[PDB]
Design a protein around this ligand. Structure first.
Ligand SMILES: O=c1[nH]c(=O)n([C@H]2C[C@H]3O[C@](c4ccccc4)(P(=O)(O)O)OC[C@H]3O2)cc1/C=C/CP(=O)(O)O
Ligand SMILES: O=c1[nH]c(=O)n([C@H]2C[C@H]3O[C@](c4ccccc4)(P(=O)(O)O)OC[C@H]3O2)cc1/C=C/CP(=O)(O)O
Ligand SMILES: [Mg+2]
Ligand SMILES: [Mg+2]
Lengths: 192, 192
């Protein structure tokens, strides 16, 4: 009865932490962007701002085999999604956009879900570059604005807080989840 | 804008021909189901009916590396979807369900679209086991019934004719496309 679309990167899987970890490992001498200093959704472009050739170095991290497979879960995310999926009159899909360089992204995302959440959740994956054409009541996603071919999506976007969006000032009509320890049940209840 | 959701297997990519090619190649002594004797969506179950050991043999074909990558296009399909996508006020997405055994399916489907239709079409893939949650005006799909969590999808299901579904006689209110040489433009225009 309430359908919740849950983003993967930035909500379930810690893309930012994995990016920084891989960058520091492969480019140990280079300046980096600490997580707390991250601003703006597109990490590559903050690195570009720091120094131009860092853009390609940071892309080489998220394009590498293993990158998606080895991401750590966001604290509390897995337990929240498991709990959420067991709620009566509640349907959960993992709604995730793959990279344009899809080669080591798409399969790895299925495998990450299989490992962390199990085969039953693999059946709930929707891979799409356009979330506005997917039907649901809520979308929990860390991107500032989620855009696509539907000017008016079916879902309300609930901004999942990450360091990169922490400083965004939202109008009163937009809601934010601070973390998975925040009151997501109340948000779901507000749509029943 | 008319948004067309186009199935991949059975509509763009010839799963049935690929299955039989691989089966004859790997299991030449075994009985097979000629293409035109296919009946029912689930190929494996017709093979099981023919002789029980053939169920696992035929699964080993569609589970193998390269199976999805090497499928031949359905006649006229690629020209049709390119033409369709190039039409004023028309948006195409490829809406496709991966196998539960996803390992050699998911990445190979992206690669098949990239090779056959190009990067602009890779951006239009929606991978989902539930098509009823995807918003569109039309879904062109060979499966006799397309089910999911949305009891009343937004799309009209246009049954794409294949040997396995040709025995079905649709009531006057439902539409079939006999092939891509059939008058698909009329079905699109009927939605504008
Ligand atoms: O969180 C992110 N942070 C980030 O810095 N990037 C990077 C990787 C690469 O991804 C893209 C991107 C755009 C849209 C959807 C998914 C991916 P790409 O266009 O290069 O593939 O965009 C610019 C680049 O920005 C992507 C992501 C993607 C998240 C997927 P989501 O929106 O489903 O959570
Ligand atoms: O056309 C088909 N014919 C066929 O015989 N099969 C086989 C492979 C394997 O696929 C499944 C299947 C079910 C639903 C969607 C996708 C795949 P699986 O449940 O094993 O993954 O079902 C039983 C098996 O039947 C699948 C397909 C899948 C097509 C995907 P689509 O509906 O998006 O075109
Ligand atoms: Mg995200
Ligand atoms: Mg099909």
């Amino acid at each position: 009865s309430v359908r919740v679309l849950v983003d993967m990167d930035g909500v379930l899987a810690d893309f930012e932490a994995g990016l920084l970890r891989g960058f520091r490992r492969r480019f140990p001498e280079e300046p980096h962007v600490p997580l707390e200093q991250r601003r703006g959704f597109l990490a590559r472009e903050q690195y570009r701002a720091l120094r131009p050739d860092l853009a390609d170095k940071v892309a080489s991290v998220y394009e590498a085999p293993g990158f998606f497979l080895d991401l750590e879960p966001i604290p509390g995310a897995l337990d929240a999604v498991r709990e959420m999926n067991d709620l009566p009159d509640t349907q959960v899909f993992i709604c995730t956009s793959p990279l344009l360089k899809y080669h080591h992204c798409v399969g790895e995302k299925y495998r990450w879900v299989e490992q962390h959440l199990g085969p039953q959740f693999v059946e709930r994956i929707i891979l799409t570059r356009d979330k506005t054409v997917v039907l649901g009541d809520l979308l929990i996603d860390d991107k500032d604005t989620v855009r696509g071919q539907e000017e008016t999506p079916s879902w309300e976007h609930i901004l999942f807080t990450c360091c990169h969006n922490r400083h965004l000032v939202l109008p009163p009509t937009r809601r934010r989840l601070l973390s998975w320890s925040d009151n997501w049940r109340e948000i779901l209840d507000s749509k029943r």
